[PDB]
Design a protein around this ligand. Structure first.
Ligand SMILES: Nc1ncnc2c1ncn2[C@@H]1O[C@H](COP(=O)(O)OP(=O)(O)O)[C@@H](O)[C@H]1O
Lengths: 129, 131
């Protein structure tokens, strides 16, 4: 059964040390920061404001380098989720939306329970890092 | 507005990857590109690629043979291209140009010899590593 595509952006902020930023969903699993797209927005632009909204992070669409993507079918929509790698941003990441953050080293990634759709991105992130 | 396109990287047993040259005289006429195309209503990007590989090359594969490899995201003048790329090592039938296009099985190091749209260009290193 044909379903609509839902585009969700994902950023992997990466430390000068190589730790990747992960965000846990507030009560009421870990995932990459990002979110749904909005009209007019390039995906790079939707990520740039979600990074500011969610983390207080300030970066340029040009600092966002395409890395990989997740593609997964749910019941009412198929998820397509491009993951961007970001090594340069201004300000330090703070949980503005009541979430808990975590900078985790490539190897400890599998210690973080993620939504099943995000799982395939982990091996890819590791090989990259 | 966003335009979604799905590209496949067919790899044969000997490491070569298939490129298809756009014909005259459509957008980006003589440039080489990874086979694929627009998605139709209700299609998963995988399903679109399955249909596309069949129409374009008479190549028959399944969704589960498609490995998320990377994506291109380029700003063009009228639309913004978001283009997921999948690796594919397993398909039935020999790849044959059905839509006019000219084909090339290129060894990874020679990927540079083939001019592509500027949007596909970042995909090459990501492909070279993967291989
Ligand atoms: N590597 C690519 N493969 C397919 N389409 C691409 C690619 N790179 C950019 N595009 C753009 O996306 C559109 C997809 O091509 P196509 O589906 O055949 O529409 P058209 O009939 O105008 O060629 C193109 O128009 C093209 O400009």
């Amino acid at each position: 059964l044909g379903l609509p595509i839902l585009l969700v952006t994902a950023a992997a902020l990466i430390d000068p040390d190589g730790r990747v930023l992960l965000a846990q969903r507030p009560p009421g699993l870990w995932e990459f920061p990002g979110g749904k797209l909005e009209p007019g927005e390039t995906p790079e632009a939707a990520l740039v404001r979600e990074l500011a909204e969610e983390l207080g992070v300030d970066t340029r669409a040009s600092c966002l380098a395409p890395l990989a993507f997740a593609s997964h079918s749910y019941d009412t929509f198929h998820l397509l989720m491009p993951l961007y790698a970001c090594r340069s941003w201004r300000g330090r990441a703070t949980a503005r939306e009541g979430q808990t953050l975590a900078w985790v080293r490539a190897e400890r990634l599998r210690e973080y329970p993620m939504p099943p759709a995000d799982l395939p991105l982990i091996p890819i992130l590791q090989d990259w890092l």
